[PDB]
Design a protein around this ligand. Sequence first.
Ligand SMILES: [Mg+2]
Length: 579
Amino acid sequence: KMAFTLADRVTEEMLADKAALVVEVVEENYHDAPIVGIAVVNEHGRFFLRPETALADPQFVAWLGDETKKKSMFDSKRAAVALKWKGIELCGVSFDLLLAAYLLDPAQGVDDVAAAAKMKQYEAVRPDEAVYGKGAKRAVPDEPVLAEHLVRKAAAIWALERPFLDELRRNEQDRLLVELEQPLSSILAEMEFAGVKVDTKRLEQMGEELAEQLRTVEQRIYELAGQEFNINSPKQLGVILFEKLQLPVLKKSKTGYSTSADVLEKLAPYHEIVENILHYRQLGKLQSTYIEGLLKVVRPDTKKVHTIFNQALTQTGRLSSTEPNLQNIPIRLEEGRKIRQAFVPSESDWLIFAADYSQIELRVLAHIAEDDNLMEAFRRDLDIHTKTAMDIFQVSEDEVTPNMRRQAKAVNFGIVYGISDYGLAQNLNISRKEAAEFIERYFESFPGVKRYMENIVQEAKQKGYVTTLLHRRRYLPDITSRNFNVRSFAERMAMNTPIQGSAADIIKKAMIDLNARLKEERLQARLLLQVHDELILEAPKEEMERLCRLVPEVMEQAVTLRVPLKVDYHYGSTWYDAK
DNA sequence: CCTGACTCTAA
DNA sequence: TGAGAGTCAGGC
Ligand SMILES: [Mg+2]
């Protein structure tokens, strides 16, 4: 039973200039969510404060907002945002244990203080799940149990700062935490708090039109099946397709017959039901995920969505977005793309501005591999897909057919995402053998990329990990494995992580640089979203001309590589038009 | 109610 | 390739 004071007023000794601070928000989505308790651990002792006491106290609030009063926390964005919703600024967070643990080993899955603490053999803190329960049973416990938990977390943070900072420094990652991930966390908190405005009326009428289309196609499907069934059930659809209608089984899943879109495309010539099922799937995906899904998470009082960015989840250093996920809004097919008409500026006479890197991953690869051919291509700002086709097929530019370019683009995509030869075969509907031939032909044209791929797998084997441009790390113990599939995956991750992770590093740096530049230039423009290689802002219409120059330049100059970086940009009345 | 399987969307 | 989400179905 750890010693602490259950204070019922704030005292001067709670406001020391260095502390471990816990501002506890138990709800998974922390927007406008309750703070259930506060703990402070510092040189003078350990303290628990009730939030209705602490957050109405002027000296405590001034302390929270004083940048010169340093705090160590876990998941400081959660606390910062919950506080933003109460009109209180949190400053001076000089160490975030969540981001520290994430940098030290993203594969650990650290999502509470106890998981971080276990990495340094500190176990005097319970997992959050043990205290709050899980799922339906999730609940805030009685004050004594809650208070001891928060104080134990704060005490762990206080104890663990030094050993985490020492390891970060041995890894050359201390500047990564302090100059990149922590400042980024503040920027993301502002982006989430600002939110993106949604034209719910547009979304609703789209939903009405979709529902009408769904009803028509659903009926057509039952007619063609001679029967009603749940079209959304791959199992029931499987019985209709493969048993009642006797279509060939081209592919199986673990548990049954495949009904994936690519399989269905190949069955379309056998039966009219198939094209109708494909149409149903496309419409139903839009309706259920995009329209019903978005509408459910728009806040009714401001008509905004406030995503939460997970900065401490992916193995590559990429951001993730939830509730809603705004990184997978349709764009490829026009029907789906219209969804983006519903994302609008939050003020009148404002516009949406979007800026994206052009081929950042292959440009990073050019730089890291020093491949002379690939570097020359980007120095000439060539269409990289056409140029790759010309090299692999050994033809002139005017002999590149559309299919040749599509296949080259597929090879390039494979390189950017670290897909296997099986994956490539699958993506191009060709044999594994032919895919191996493509890949081999690629390495003959880009021998420096071949050399990089060989060298980085050996490096991963020797060191145990690979690193990105800004010193992010991914451990790959699977690389040795005697299981071929397990090992091959590890090798692909060794190849791909420095590409994808360096691209992540760059855009994170761009974000930091951009936020600083916007303030220096006294613009009202604000950052709303990041979608891997693009940044989405809204600004007064009078700022567009300046942003057209400023944003690409900041992004382009974020790092200096052996090849240029190139940023394209667009703006308009909705995210759709920012194209 | 919880969890795994299947499908689909983006980069 | 990574992630997030919706839906179903089996086990509870
Ligand atoms: Mg792009």
